[model samples]
Target chain A: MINAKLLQLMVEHSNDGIVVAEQEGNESILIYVNPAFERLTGYCADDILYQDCRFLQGEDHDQPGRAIIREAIREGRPCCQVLRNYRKDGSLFWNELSITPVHNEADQLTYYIGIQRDVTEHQQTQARLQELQSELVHVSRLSAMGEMASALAHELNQPLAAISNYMKGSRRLLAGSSDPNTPKVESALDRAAEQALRAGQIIRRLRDFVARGESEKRVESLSKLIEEAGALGLAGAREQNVQLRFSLDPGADLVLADRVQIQQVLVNLFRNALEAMAQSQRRELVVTNTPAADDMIEVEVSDTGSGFQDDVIPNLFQTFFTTKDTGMGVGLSISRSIIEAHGGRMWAESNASGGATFRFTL
Target chain B: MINAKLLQLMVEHSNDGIVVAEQEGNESILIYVNPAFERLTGYCADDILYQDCRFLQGEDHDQPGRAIIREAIREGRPCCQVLRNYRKDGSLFWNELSITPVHNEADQLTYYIGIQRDVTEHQQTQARLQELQSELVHVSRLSAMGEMASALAHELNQPLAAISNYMKGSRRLLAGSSDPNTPKVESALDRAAEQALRAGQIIRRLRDFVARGESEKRVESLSKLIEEAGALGLAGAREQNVQLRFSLDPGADLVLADRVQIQQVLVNLFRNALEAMAQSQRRELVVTNTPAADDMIEVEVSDTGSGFQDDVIPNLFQTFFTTKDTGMGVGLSISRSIIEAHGGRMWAESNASGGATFRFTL
Candidate 1:
């Protein structure tokens, strides 16, 4: 019934390596290897007779798949993985392998069979895509608390604001009293207002820093970051009557960054931009997005304000550096830390047109 | 060299069917078949002649093995797979098959050869193991939110705890001064505590529903999580006088995972172990490890605290639907989701006599 010629050709000729191993206790010994095995590995079938597949994978199989394959074999189950394997000539190729245990009708394990194919090219592509997806994670302890950021801000502010109102009310209570507690209430109220505003300023960054990986990272649009930060900082810009403008490049929008932390940095920049613009006669605020070299994404917040004074620029990222005259110039400092923690660098430059340009990459 | 009688026996009475197909279009024309081939299909030479082996597979093959085998033949390579096929009586069997492409000395592709043996039994075992693995992923999909909730709730906790305490103290402060804004501050404090209740559950549910928007996995800093968890867990550890020590497997600390979830899990484990050891006196919580280079990462989280009972170990990761007496029993349950999402399995057991030893992988 079977065609002899076709059977003969198949036995003498297919291209891929075909291996069948006899099952031993915890190990398997090679029993059969076809001609393609010899052609592919440069090792004759005879040379590998009775040898373990581990020997074929020896010394060079460093991928995570080895452990998985071993566990499956120990349990007599089928397992598959793509791993690095070496040919007889010592050259390496990615081995896409699948193995299964064969059992006879008596329901006892009899043989172990393995299929191997080379998949180096496809693996290379997967590696690059993973590399691209790798950027968002450079951050450690980001200050984004998700939805709770706003909730915490409101909750914290309400108490501080209430404390201020109480201090004012209490001062009147003490002013009417012939007690020395009246003066203490005034100083306490004064310090209370400062720290409360400091609380208000720092509240912007007071997030839980809880990172999430429940879903894939989105293309962090730099334009979107600037857009949101601009909106938040607009009240500051408007009180100063500073004109806001943006020139964002389309392709440079997507970046490798945590959304809120990056937004926090941008908002800090925009706020600083507005604060800087308060005294400048030019009264203009501009933001731009562009691609940086080395495949990095860059965003710049430039304004017609006095740039970083030469002195504090050197220690800008330090916790207490500030540009304003009683202000603990910490706004830019905190922003710098957030940016640095994201593996992105930030710096300021003097614009040729007598303005300051602050730029950062993500 | 090739064995003559072995070759004859392989083509004649051997158990596996053998056949050869040409290298032409559609992989046309089966050129030969053997006696074993006839025995396999109950079809004599007349049935399969001039036809490709596609009919043998019919439409039953949807297994991943099909791609591997197809790749091998298309590239004139060798590969193997276990597939489903129907007998002459139309009954199905798991057919273990291996194929190789034949080439002449000039390297021109000639014919394809395949060997077939029925292996339906052990294949089922392999499926069971995979099914068990798939079940873990299913469970993860369900409780990833729970893990996300707890992990986020974890470190942000000291604040959640601190904020609540501050408000508790504020109530007394309010008693000291009865003003109009006092109720507002109290209301604010009340809202803060309410948000944090299942800050672990409700927040996760909220985010997931929003995602219903998402960014996904990465290599995380195991040390940072360890650093934060140790400090927060220390108060309890100190209350119990538990000496906590950490020796990270420096080389392997970076694992492919979500940083927040990983952080949350370590925090949960450390906290649980600490609480479990409260009255046991010689309480010590140590997190030790192995490097990433090789597979054996057997950990010994030897905590002197009283651990879960031995009988509950298997079901420890499953849902308990707990009680007030359980006192946040879901800590371990949520931690289970963290491991599940990382594509690893983690389990805990009582230290035979009394304490708890937890073991896990990435």
Candidate 2:
């Protein structure tokens, strides 16, 4: 048996708000409440002992949290959740609650131990922090873009130079008129104009990258996107001696998404698979797009590489939760964040034959 | 009109395996095949043209691949897939095939363009590579355990030291005789023994970690594991002022899984949610565990944050797919691999109100 003094000590010092409730017909009567309970709900034991917890429920109390609690009791099992509750002063707070059902050896329902923790402050602080971090990431991306400006300028310059050459050649041919094929000269001029237009198009695409706003949704062809991304990914795969395969669903319908962001997603997945199989003898990556019901699109990227370790799988998407020696543990988290923002979902699955398959539905 | 010479050049120089089949009564006859087709299928154009392509089929050919193709043709649509096919030498090969139905502007089916690519070598290479990579990761994990040995020893030493202190104090009190309380002494000894046993258990767990083997699957209470992992995650969340909330269906049944691996999966998801909401004004991380079906359990980790960019949704799970400046991008890939190996699926969805929800079924 647990020491009574120790149990008492635990009740007094526990960070979780503890309350003992005695079963009285369909309702549970409060018998004892710890200091944490008072701090969480702003109600002292003197004010609540022998009283129902409904006292904490006010006009703003969440209906769902209460419904879940009622269901848990009806089923006579433990329940845990974050519930919105009202403090004695009529202020709202979020409470992390965990309740355990106590039963006799005969399996008769006895009482319950309810643990409540006030999480309002913590939740508020986190919201502020996330905003700040997002701002920082945006700023950093902009800074990186500034550094890349020179490289981009050089890229643009090459096309411009080609256009200039074509224009000069066409003009010279047209001016040197002796027995000149006028149609050929016209064709040369058209080629020069096409080159200039190509440069302009490149600039337009680059400008879109820096354009402000979140991704815009539109009907998109999965097969076309996969093929384009696959062609690009294959070069990287070949460079790393990795084999890339595409298992695209031809019948897959157009999905609502931002074309550019989807491309980024595919590229990121492809690059990751290539890296994971960097040390493998048979480096292979498969990209598959399939149709899912509920007006969703499913894409799976599978890689032949070492699967997750038992201890590593749960924390894989957590920020700073990295297995790699030099990783920030934010890729999947951010990728997931992006996917979710687009009315979609992302996840991973292990292949029975080995390796991992990352899947997302949009 | 377009240049016929250019079209001919494309047909002859294209690396892609190209074949043109014309309808002949109820069957399709191969009218033309490129060199790349011969290279991919091990069949010469001279021998295959004017004949049905069924000769490429074998018992090993994937039924689904063939069925899908037939269905597509019957439906008068395009189709594509990788399927097992027999070569001229009778060797099994995986053929990546894409069939596009050509039609006049009036929508009449005219001819079909079939592109076939050999991928058997690619698939084999991938399988082999993954095996090697997994072995490497296992070896590295073992090596990392050596570094953790001192931490394990320290953990064990704490309990051992406490037990020693208790025993010594109890022995001295008993020896003094004047203040000897037999019951108190006995209790102290019991506590000391418990501490010693606890220390031994930790050591056993540490040893087990060092010694690797196949993990065994068994029925487990997911709530218990989530609570344990959540407690650790909560401590981390506290540092960022993130509030962690858990909503578990009381009726959720036992799941068949390797306990350690399942714990890892939950931990990864919890951490991911926490990280996503780390900077939000209302940093709320909600984890809901619900019964999916008789054979499955579904867990969802949702976070209120900036939400995902729509473009990134499709490739969220690709290996090494990351937008983070400091990430290696393997966590989700590996995690999914582990889950898929266990015959489960993981996916993600973004909410309209902002934020992402990662849902997995096992």
Candidate 3:
């Protein structure tokens, strides 16, 4: 037989915080708490026993996770939650808390036994890890920015050089002779300045698309996002005369998303699709959006081009991996980060139409 | 009153495994087990009851942590451990198990109660996180390689250009006159070929030094490693005319280490110190090893140079954060990965001697 006094001594001396509460009406009242519990919560046993256990959560106890505890108790089931809980000093800590329902011999609810661990340190470490990984993705964006910068430098140099040459020639023309040919020189100067203006406009557009850190999130309509991205991409597609299409399922299109980020992902896919089709005789892009399942909204981008080889497919999304010469070789890792940050996943696959499709759930 | 039958129902249906064992011949025999215990270990109550609890640990249960459990039970003390246990199906699962000895009315040991959790999924998640973080560090290494490649392009370009001019002059002489008559041209061709070979060697050596992926690990003595690394660093220090010193504790210099990787970390610290002390009139570097309090050893590399700014300290080890124009900024992040992977930690701080002190525990 086990000694009840020894069991009592065990509970009183344990390093882990243990609390036993019994339901009195709709609220759980603390019947007993170990010394560790008092130390962890900084609440004296005399002041806590027979009081509502909600005192530990302070005034703001309406978090959905708190309701989950009440729900479990009502259903006479066990549940665990990592909750933002408050101590007697009102400092917040991440609590790894679990509870099991206790019953009597006659099958009646008696008490609830709770196990609590201050997991604040663990949570902080995980949070820091997440932040670093997110920034790693951001660095990939910087890599992509580097690619765009070189492209801009090479492309803009032509027009800027033209403007300089034209002005120099015009200055020489004005100094040497003001004649009938002076009008031709003036026209050349005007055209060169106009080319510079066009380059400035392109630079501004590129700035708009260049990603900044931690964009704001908002609940947005999926169809609208797809449409905006398609419109922006079709302008670039016209340069290659590529056909772009998107089909949206009407009833299910809402998502908690960053509008700029979702659109950026869509446009990146479209640009890749155009480039993929560059060697093929046919040029086409297809996109789709469907209703959410398990709190996720999915978007698909497909292209009518020869798909990536079986060997190359696995590393297609990894940073610095590319088959195209113009590629920044940026990560599908960042694509993964964006979708996962939205609590979803992103992946790619070959299509039956002799192409490949990229899909992400947000 | 709490009913025994309902209490049994609660225990039997709980998701967490629960066990009750009583002593027999200095070993604990299973008296009762919850349904969850049967599911966890794939052993039915009929087969396990009345059997020694060690049966759950299989034939090989001599791990040090297992002894802690037995010692605690013998002392009638409560203890917790995450031990490797085998299931009846021969599958290995991590068991987060805790045992508390129960005593009789006279306070002598009588029975033992245990709680178990199958933390296999949690273990898998943390492993996956480590893998991703390692990959993140690898990507940073790739970023560093990019910078090295550019430097290679710049530095090697001059030699190649010289070789090209020399060969062109030799070719022009050969075309204009009989090659045997042009001794200067022949010597120029020979020198050009030598320069080309020198460039090849530099490229090969550069590739060897730049880390590409996570390095394999091996155990080695800490003092010996520090000596080897210090010797390697002193060559560069002598070239820079920098004074170097080492102080190692006689005992407690053992570690489970990766020789090449740890040496690489040390070399990186040395190179960084050399670069940081570029403008310092008094160049001094101190290396030290000591017994750490946490059953580990400490290695410190201190450089008397312009210390990092207050704002820079926070993100000093972050990827791509650099004070130097050509810094790839990947070393410290990889250093963090290497140390952390070894169940150790690495960090840097501004020392009172007006320099940065890089320290890690292993």
Candidate 4:
């Protein structure tokens, strides 16, 4: 058994407004409503009783929902739907409405009950999330392009320089006054042709870098690779007023690696070293390769600059961890990733004097 | 000139694992790890490199970080610190280390470049975040609780009443009690004795719903509140199975309201109505309020139920939203926030009919 007073207490205390109405001809007239009704609809019971519900419907009212309501009422049945409605102040909102026809003991229709709910904000949040996902995709594409361009520049410069040197020598010889022997002239011409071939070899290497090739397995030279990486870093060093140097032991020979990808890895390492020292007044970079016992080769690159700050040092190679304002923070991480992919590892150490070193093994 | 060959091939062709160690002795490592090392560490490179990195240490490691390495290799001059490392496979990893001593022309050491990263998964996630921010306080609190008996009981009893009353009440009223006023008289007596005492009323309300003494405001008649809710639902009559019936009339008294918070507020009313008919055979709910223009009210709790579903509607008047197995999915309780903030509204639909219709007003 329930108490009427308790029921009254509950209604009086309900958070959402409640309203009761009765039918008069084709429309329903408001008879009772709670304070919540006035709070929600901006209409007092004095302004609403005996009035039709059309006051709450506006230009924005859900036409389809209204049609369904008419149909259900005509059939003398119950129905529920979400409808668009307007408040007395003209604010639009969503309402989940339910209506049922009440019958007396004779089963004759006596009255109808309807309930409304507002749901405007939930729909708005879902729309915003969709927009963010598309933006992320665009940003990722741009990042990939920048990485590819930097990689191309690093890998194509060496053989191009060699080719230029060969061409210059051949031109100088041809301009000399002395009548040269057929063999000597032919050799000179052949040497020029050989350098041109070397240029082609360089171009081929560049093409391979750009191509999305299958991962290949092979043993590769560590010393030669270090020398190439050092040469590539020279221009960047000059730009930053840094002196670059490399020392490679002849004993540190080959380890298994793909020819093109290893060069890409070294390029990323060199670039990272350059960027790390970008803010330093005194910039110096050194590259070295040494033989570790067993089948390992160790390569190290060190910089003389403001050594890593305590905060930055720990996350140096983490993807998206960057101190530079415009940095992607992926270079060292990607470099390490590349090396490890070949059955190796990479890590960093801070110099007590004030700089950092990046080291890796094959 | 950059070495095209180096850029084009080194990353894929490198023979050794490579890592750019930071300047500091911190043991944090970053993302460039390869699949081979990941297989060894039981951690992906991405996870380790995401933030303040500290993934390589484990409880077994002798010295967890670079601080230990610095202590071990006290080279007064800046130099590389190397150590024998162990891999996840329990195999030894030999780290060949070197450091470049960068100095002024006077030969004073300015910084050192050290390299030697091994393939090991011996580190644990560092305690830096825990040390800096105490964000995990809630997790620790939940761990301290020994039992949850009260919470489980609350969960089980709530929905049982919602379902049974609609079934039970319809049968009792239909059976025609010899004394029609017996139930009402008994209920009113109970209210006078139990509810008249403020504490008893509070305790009874709290027994079913958690009470937050927030909603109390405005003069309102019970009948009109039900009528308005039903009228709002007339728009969406086609989809829902439940029927709504109202017996309230015009000229009911007013309640103080914000006027914007009450119209069509559906979070609770619609939810209760839906739950009442959720398992009903007839899927009907009828609401009735007498005296077309009365200040004091007569509201009905009629349902088509063969009998009432439960002895009482648990926490029916409590401020907290009912927690059903399906849960109160809408922001109905939040509506209570609005109602209480404004100073009036409450609820009291129960599972008395083969369906339920709560009625309340003040």
Give lDDT per model, in order: 0.57, 0.59, 0.64, 0.45
Model 1 complex DockQ against the native: 0.07
Model 3 chain A: worst 10 consecutive residues (lDDT sum): A147-156
Docking tier of model 2: it is: incorrect
Query: Residue by residue across A1-362, what tens digits does model 3's lDDT show?
Result: 23333444545555566677777768778777778788888888887788876767777666778889878888988888877778877898877777887665454657777777677977775554444333343344343444433333444455344434534443343443324433443454344335444544544443333333455677688886676556444434533546666688776677777765676566567656766777776667878877657766677788878888788988886545667643545435445656777767788999877788898887
**Best to worst by TM-score, what's the order?**
3, 1, 2, 4
Per-residue C-alpha lDDT of model 1 across residues A152-188, encoded as one tens digit per residue: 4444456545544554454454444443433443454
| Top-lDDT candidate index | 3
- TM-score leader: 3
| TM-score of predicted structure 1, chain A | 0.40
Writing each residue's lDDT as its tens digit, candidate 3 over B261-337 gives 67657756876887788777678898888777767778888888888988999997775466865444656766776
CA RMSD of all predictions: 18.2, 38.9, 26.1, 42.0
TM-score of each: 0.40, 0.32, 0.43, 0.26
- Model 1: what TM-score? 0.40
Error of 2 at B298 (Å): 16
